[PDB]
Design an enzyme around this catalytic site. Sequence first.
Site, PDB file in Angstrom:
ATOM      1  N   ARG A 204       7.421   3.707  -6.583  1.00  0.00           N
ATOM      2  CA  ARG A 204       8.217   4.759  -5.959  1.00  0.00           C
ATOM      3  C   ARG A 204       9.124   5.517  -6.919  1.00  0.00           C
ATOM      4  O   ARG A 204       9.694   6.534  -6.504  1.00  0.00           O
ATOM      5  CB  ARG A 204       9.042   4.177  -4.828  1.00  0.00           C
ATOM      6  CG  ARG A 204       8.221   3.919  -3.593  1.00  0.00           C
ATOM      7  CD  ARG A 204       9.106   3.389  -2.537  1.00  0.00           C
ATOM      8  NE  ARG A 204       9.409   1.974  -2.750  1.00  0.00           N
ATOM      9  CZ  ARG A 204      10.330   1.300  -2.074  1.00  0.00           C
ATOM     10  NH1 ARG A 204      11.127   1.907  -1.200  1.00  0.00           N
ATOM     11  NH2 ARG A 204      10.435  -0.023  -2.254  1.00  0.00           N
TER      12      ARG A 204
ATOM     13  N   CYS B  47       5.960  -0.522  -1.826  1.00  0.00           N
ATOM     14  CA  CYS B  47       5.424   0.280  -2.920  1.00  0.00           C
ATOM     15  C   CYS B  47       6.327   0.151  -4.140  1.00  0.00           C
ATOM     16  O   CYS B  47       7.491   0.569  -4.107  1.00  0.00           O
ATOM     17  CB  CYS B  47       5.272   1.755  -2.542  1.00  0.00           C
ATOM     18  SG  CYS B  47       4.590   2.713  -3.930  1.00  0.00           S
TER      19      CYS B  47
ATOM     20  N   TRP C 264      -1.989   5.968  -8.721  1.00  0.00           N
ATOM     21  CA  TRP C 264      -2.812   5.330  -9.733  1.00  0.00           C
ATOM     22  C   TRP C 264      -2.524   3.840  -9.666  1.00  0.00           C
ATOM     23  O   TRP C 264      -1.542   3.408  -9.061  1.00  0.00           O
ATOM     24  CB  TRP C 264      -2.553   5.878 -11.143  1.00  0.00           C
ATOM     25  CG  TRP C 264      -1.125   5.865 -11.552  1.00  0.00           C
ATOM     26  CD1 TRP C 264      -0.395   4.792 -11.984  1.00  0.00           C
ATOM     27  CD2 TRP C 264      -0.242   6.994 -11.576  1.00  0.00           C
ATOM     28  NE1 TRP C 264       0.895   5.190 -12.291  1.00  0.00           N
ATOM     29  CE2 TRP C 264       1.017   6.531 -12.029  1.00  0.00           C
ATOM     30  CE3 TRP C 264      -0.395   8.355 -11.250  1.00  0.00           C
ATOM     31  CZ2 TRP C 264       2.111   7.375 -12.175  1.00  0.00           C
ATOM     32  CZ3 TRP C 264       0.691   9.195 -11.397  1.00  0.00           C
ATOM     33  CH2 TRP C 264       1.934   8.705 -11.859  1.00  0.00           C
TER      34      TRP C 264
ATOM     35  N   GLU D 205      -3.260  -5.190  -9.332  1.00  0.00           N
ATOM     36  CA  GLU D 205      -4.032  -5.018  -8.103  1.00  0.00           C
ATOM     37  C   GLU D 205      -5.503  -5.254  -8.377  1.00  0.00           C
ATOM     38  O   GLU D 205      -6.211  -5.874  -7.583  1.00  0.00           O
ATOM     39  CB  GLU D 205      -3.851  -3.603  -7.526  1.00  0.00           C
ATOM     40  CG  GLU D 205      -2.449  -3.186  -7.267  1.00  0.00           C
ATOM     41  CD  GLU D 205      -2.367  -1.711  -6.859  1.00  0.00           C
ATOM     42  OE1 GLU D 205      -2.674  -1.395  -5.688  1.00  0.00           O
ATOM     43  OE2 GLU D 205      -2.008  -0.863  -7.704  1.00  0.00           O
TER      44      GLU D 205
HETATM   45  C1  HEM Z   1       1.863   6.776  -8.429  1.00  0.00           C
HETATM   46  C2  HEM Z   1       1.524   5.496  -8.670  1.00  0.00           C
HETATM   47  C3  HEM Z   1       1.610   4.396  -7.583  1.00  0.00           C
HETATM   48  C4  HEM Z   1       1.652   3.091  -7.869  1.00  0.00           C
HETATM   49  C5  HEM Z   1       1.610   2.494  -9.293  1.00  0.00           C
HETATM   50  C6  HEM Z   1       1.734   2.355  -6.635  1.00  0.00           C
HETATM   51  C7  HEM Z   1       1.783   0.990  -6.492  1.00  0.00           C
HETATM   52  C8  HEM Z   1       1.653   0.309  -5.304  1.00  0.00           C
HETATM   53  C9  HEM Z   1       1.327  -1.095  -5.136  1.00  0.00           C
HETATM   54  C10 HEM Z   1       1.051  -2.093  -6.270  1.00  0.00           C
HETATM   55  C11 HEM Z   1       1.310  -1.357  -3.833  1.00  0.00           C
HETATM   56  C12 HEM Z   1       0.994  -2.701  -3.162  1.00  0.00           C
HETATM   57  C13 HEM Z   1      -0.447  -2.587  -2.708  1.00  0.00           C
HETATM   58  C14 HEM Z   1      -1.096  -3.923  -2.455  1.00  0.00           C
HETATM   59  O1  HEM Z   1      -0.831  -4.903  -3.176  1.00  0.00           O
HETATM   60  O2  HEM Z   1      -1.957  -3.988  -1.544  1.00  0.00           O
HETATM   61  C15 HEM Z   1       1.607  -0.136  -3.122  1.00  0.00           C
HETATM   62  C16 HEM Z   1       1.684   0.000  -1.761  1.00  0.00           C
HETATM   63  C17 HEM Z   1       1.929   1.182  -1.099  1.00  0.00           C
HETATM   64  N1  HEM Z   1       2.139   2.413  -1.689  1.00  0.00           N
HETATM   65 FE1  HEM Z   1       2.299   2.800  -3.648  1.00  0.00          FE
HETATM   66  N2  HEM Z   1       1.762   3.265  -5.588  1.00  0.00           N
HETATM   67  C18 HEM Z   1       1.668   4.534  -6.143  1.00  0.00           C
HETATM   68  C19 HEM Z   1       1.636   5.712  -5.413  1.00  0.00           C
HETATM   69  C20 HEM Z   1       1.842   5.834  -4.063  1.00  0.00           C
HETATM   70  C21 HEM Z   1       1.841   7.083  -3.309  1.00  0.00           C
HETATM   71  C22 HEM Z   1       1.560   8.445  -3.956  1.00  0.00           C
HETATM   72  C23 HEM Z   1       2.091   6.798  -2.020  1.00  0.00           C
HETATM   73  C24 HEM Z   1       2.220   7.707  -0.772  1.00  0.00           C
HETATM   74  C25 HEM Z   1       2.548   9.010  -0.799  1.00  0.00           C
HETATM   75  C26 HEM Z   1       2.282   5.361  -1.937  1.00  0.00           C
HETATM   76  C27 HEM Z   1       2.570   4.665  -0.797  1.00  0.00           C
HETATM   77  C28 HEM Z   1       2.339   3.322  -0.659  1.00  0.00           C
HETATM   78  C29 HEM Z   1       2.270   2.619   0.588  1.00  0.00           C
HETATM   79  C30 HEM Z   1       2.446   3.206   1.993  1.00  0.00           C
HETATM   80  C31 HEM Z   1       2.024   1.345   0.328  1.00  0.00           C
HETATM   81  C32 HEM Z   1       1.860   0.273   1.420  1.00  0.00           C
HETATM   82  C33 HEM Z   1       3.148  -0.526   1.504  1.00  0.00           C
HETATM   83  C34 HEM Z   1       4.071  -0.057   2.611  1.00  0.00           C
HETATM   84  O3  HEM Z   1       3.553   0.434   3.651  1.00  0.00           O
HETATM   85  O4  HEM Z   1       5.326  -0.189   2.458  1.00  0.00           O
HETATM   86  N3  HEM Z   1       2.119   4.804  -3.191  1.00  0.00           N
HETATM   87  N4  HEM Z   1       1.816   0.858  -4.047  1.00  0.00           N
HETATM   88  C1  LIG Z   2      -3.924  -3.453  -3.949  1.00  0.00           C
HETATM   89  N1  LIG Z   2      -5.205  -3.082  -3.329  1.00  0.00           N
HETATM   90  C2  LIG Z   2      -5.121  -2.571  -1.938  1.00  0.00           C
HETATM   91  C3  LIG Z   2      -4.033  -1.537  -1.704  1.00  0.00           C
HETATM   92  C4  LIG Z   2      -3.406  -1.529  -0.461  1.00  0.00           C
HETATM   93  C5  LIG Z   2      -2.414  -0.615  -0.193  1.00  0.00           C
HETATM   94  C6  LIG Z   2      -1.775  -0.672   0.920  1.00  0.00           C
HETATM   95  N2  LIG Z   2      -1.197  -0.677   1.923  1.00  0.00           N
HETATM   96  C7  LIG Z   2      -2.006   0.282  -1.179  1.00  0.00           C
HETATM   97  C8  LIG Z   2      -2.634   0.290  -2.410  1.00  0.00           C
HETATM   98  C9  LIG Z   2      -2.211   1.285  -3.425  1.00  0.00           C
HETATM   99  C10 LIG Z   2      -1.989   2.594  -2.992  1.00  0.00           C
HETATM  100  C11 LIG Z   2      -1.585   3.555  -3.899  1.00  0.00           C
HETATM  101  C12 LIG Z   2      -1.347   4.964  -3.399  1.00  0.00           C
HETATM  102  C13 LIG Z   2      -1.416   3.188  -5.245  1.00  0.00           C
HETATM  103  C14 LIG Z   2      -1.653   1.852  -5.628  1.00  0.00           C
HETATM  104  N3  LIG Z   2      -1.526   1.431  -6.897  1.00  0.00           N
HETATM  105  N4  LIG Z   2      -2.049   0.934  -4.729  1.00  0.00           N
HETATM  106  C15 LIG Z   2      -3.658  -0.596  -2.668  1.00  0.00           C
HETATM  107 CL   LIG Z   3      -7.184  -1.742  -4.336  1.00  0.00          CL
END
Ligand code: HEM
Ligand SMILES: CNCc1cc(C#N)cc(-c2cc(C)cc(N)n2)c1
Ligand SMILES: [Cl-]
EC number: 1.14.13.39
Lengths: 402, 401
Positions: free
Chosen positions: B108, B105, B277, B282
């Site tokens: 973070r 993520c 968001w 993505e």
């Molecule tokens: C607030 C704005 C956020 C942004 C901009 C963001 C961005 C991203 C991005 C770009 C990914 C990769 C997803 C992909 O390419 O499939 C990701 C994965 C992920 N995000 Fe974030 N995220 C946000 C919020 C959150 C929140 C609120 C949570 C959980 C409380 C979260 C937990 C995760 C998890 C679990 C993954 C899967 C990767 C892993 O398991 O290590 N994200 N996020």
């Molecule tokens: C990038 N499209 C699929 C996708 C997969 C996973 C996972 N794991 C997580 C996201 C995701 C989740 C959150 C909370 C924010 C974000 N920008 N992407 C989006």
């Molecule tokens: Cl998505």
Amino acid sequence: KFPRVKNWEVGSITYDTLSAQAQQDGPCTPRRCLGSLVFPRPEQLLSQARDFINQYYSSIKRSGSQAHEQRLQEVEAEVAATGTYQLRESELVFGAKQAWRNAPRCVGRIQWGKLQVFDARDCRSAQEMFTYICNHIKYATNRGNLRSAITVFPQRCPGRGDFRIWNSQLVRYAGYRQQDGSVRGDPANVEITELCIQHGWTPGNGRFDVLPLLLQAPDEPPELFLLPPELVLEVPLEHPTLEWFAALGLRWYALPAVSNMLLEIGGLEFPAAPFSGWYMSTEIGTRNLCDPHRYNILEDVAVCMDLDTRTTSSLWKDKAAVEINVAVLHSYQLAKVTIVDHHAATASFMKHLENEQKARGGCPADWAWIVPPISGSLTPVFHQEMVNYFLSPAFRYQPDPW
Amino acid sequence: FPRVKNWEVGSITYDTLSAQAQQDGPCTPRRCLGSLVFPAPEQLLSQARDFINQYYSSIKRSGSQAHEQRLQEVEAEVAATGTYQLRESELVFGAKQAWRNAPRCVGRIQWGKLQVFDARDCRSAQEMFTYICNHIKYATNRGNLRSAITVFPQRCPGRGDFRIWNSQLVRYAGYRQQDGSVRGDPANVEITELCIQHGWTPGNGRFDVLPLLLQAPDEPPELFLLPPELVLEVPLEHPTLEWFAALGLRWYALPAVSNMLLEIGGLEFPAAPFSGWYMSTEIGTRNLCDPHRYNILEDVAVCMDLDTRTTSSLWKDKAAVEINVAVLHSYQLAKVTIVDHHAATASFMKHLENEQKARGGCPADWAWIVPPISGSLTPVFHQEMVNYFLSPAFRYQPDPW
Ligand code: HEM
Ligand SMILES: CNCc1cc(C#N)cc(-c2cc(C)cc(N)n2)c1
Ligand SMILES: [Cl-]
Ligand code: HEM
Ligand SMILES: CNCc1cc(C#N)cc(-c2cc(C)cc(N)n2)c1
Ligand SMILES: C[C@H](O)[C@H](O)[C@H]1CNc2nc(N)[nH]c(=O)c2N1
Ligand SMILES: C[C@H](O)[C@H](O)[C@H]1CNc2nc(N)[nH]c(=O)c2N1
Ligand SMILES: [Cl-]
Ligand SMILES: [Gd]
Ligand SMILES: [Gd]
Ligand SMILES: [Gd]
Ligand SMILES: [Zn+2]
């Protein structure tokens, strides 16, 4: 025990059974992955020689047959009588091709079978090196029709100094500090530029001065060598439609020739074994020209394109970078200098992976290095899971000779 | 302790936090598998004990009376029931830590600002749906998106799991076509067929929002349609390519992952959807340009008059950049929160620096952190990273079907 490897664009699945043969431990443990780290830190010679000889003979379908056993005894006798051995010409060739084939971070390995091997193992003195290096450069460059080549200088022997090229590549641009520390030229080469000056070189003023070579014969402090300018093929950078781009004065050289890596074949070590191929355009256009710690030209090009550099969300960086890569490809093609774009390069690498799956049961590939530094997921390697591991023979990194 | 270099600046740190890596990942000294997408009361007790220690350190009460009280309380609850219940404050802290610990993520920097909805009293699939609709409403916030997670009851012996069958709360249907093609999102062909198989009347558009398949314990999944006005969507247009609007592309505002397992102190929440968001890549790069997704790259490039007959014109790169421009522009026009990959990676660099001070390191998965376009133009490309598994954690889990 056989890693499952998936391609996410197509859904196809393979198993990397070749990973089972990995010798040198990588940096990763079950507890943490260190895959993004660039550098992650007496009869052991016979086991590595035996292994390499067996490799050679299976590759010519001659395992367990006359010449194989005979060659097994001669290396046994050679190390017994001398504490080392000499590679047969054919083995040195085969080992060079295998080290290349095994280079996990090399996206160009579809070419691994086509490698010209210059044998400089009878080299003695830095002057001799310079003529070898000059033979290599002229051969590899070939008026812009680039040809993959490696020159193998004498192996390492106990109790006697090494052959070393002090430059990281055969062609590098100078980096000059200022009345303010900052750099005119290539900031990556501030160190070697200050070594060349500290060894007699009259420094230039410009942003693209080809550095001299520092060549180190065993147990001799190095000697400076001016490269013949007509032997250093460079490409002035212009853009097909951005007429002002040429006026930026950017150039890059034709030949990517890595000269600081140690070639290891069958336990034998060659700290001087410069290899060259041809560039992938993102190496020049993206890394060399746009990295913030390199020429860092991205914002200048964006100013010239009249891009809105005040907001990141205009993606002005992305646009300027793409046009720089366009300029590189256009300029090299116009100069008829071999270059490959990252789309062609990665598609050929996918073909390489498929070949190697059939030939050897897999392929050591370093995802972070195979995926290009721009447009990663637009290339097929992005969606290809990869397994990274060390096979021998190999190119290894080695400490700076100072 | 691994030494970690930033190559843009030259700075060097040591990831002492990795030494506390709980569960083991897929790599060995023989081979790195970092690029792979998907790599008993006593051990519940030690997990719980470690989480309680984490919680009491966060509230600057480590080693205090309350701390040992909770440790003994949990041990005796595990002794008497095989499990234990989180206090509300522990659940909030554990959900934020799970986000903080998520190595892939890039968002973070936001990890502390997370709205935690405690749905652990949820009783049915119907109540589950209401909680989910409230999550979506709160999180979307008319386009001013708010990070949130809704935590449904934990796994416990004797009852099945709450599960959301959808991989995200908002997904577009993918219909296998007459001639083997997919209309809509090919990533969602499976969940689409499941919805149909469970009584949903499909559409035939490219952007049909899927119903929710909600599983209450020991229940078949139940179909729930999302009220259309709950699902905020963004028509996609390009600020200067006026034909781009005629592509009819849309995307939704809320990325809400719904198929991951939340693990806190050994307890498992198989249903705990979370949402933030989008980062624009993505949508613009992966969802629209992946060959196995909407695959619009060539069509855009042809419309842009680019020469698609040769790779060295970089038509792919040019067309992808404009698709990403269109995404950012469209979400800004619509006043829907979005972050571009330059701002997101710069804020992630601040996260790593904050985490180095706070914890002595930060689990980060380089290949997921580096954006899929313009990789080395963002600072994270030049940052070495150490990937490892800390708990509390979001984990992947098998599909319930
Ligand atoms: C607030 C704005 C956020 C942004 C901009 C963001 C961005 C991203 C991005 C770009 C990914 C990769 C997803 C992909 O390419 O499939 C990701 C994965 C992920 N995000 Fe974030 N995220 C946000 C919020 C959150 C929140 C609120 C949570 C959980 C409380 C979260 C937990 C995760 C998890 C679990 C993954 C899967 C990767 C892993 O398991 O290590 N994200 N996020
Ligand atoms: C990038 N499209 C699929 C996708 C997969 C996973 C996972 N794991 C997580 C996201 C995701 C989740 C959150 C909370 C924010 C974000 N920008 N992407 C989006
Ligand atoms: Cl998505
Ligand atoms: C023929 C065209 C070739 C192309 C297009 C090519 C491309 C590349 C690229 C882009 C890299 C990444 C390096 C970086 O970004 O810093 C690389 C690395 C490397 N290449 Fe190649 N290369 C070619 C030929 C060769 C040859 C001829 C050899 C040796 C005989 C070789 C061996 C290596 C090695 C040792 C590395 C360092 C990474 C590693 O050790 O795994 N390459 N190559
Ligand atoms: C990216 N520019 C620096 C660079 C570093 C390393 C390594 N190690 C390797 C190369 C290289 C080497 C060869 C034979 C071809 C090529 N296109 N790049 C280039
Ligand atoms: C920190 C990161 O691993 C480092 O910058 C790597 C990433 N991938 C790379 N890939 C290539 N081809 N060349 C490089 O120098 C790097 N650098
Ligand atoms: C095979 C490869 O690891 C895979 O396609 C990964 C690479 N990095 C990624 N990074 C992000 N953020 N999202 C992804 O889906 C992927 N996919
Ligand atoms: Cl280079
Ligand atoms: Gd102008
Ligand atoms: Gd226009
Ligand atoms: Gd059309
Ligand atoms: Zn690894």
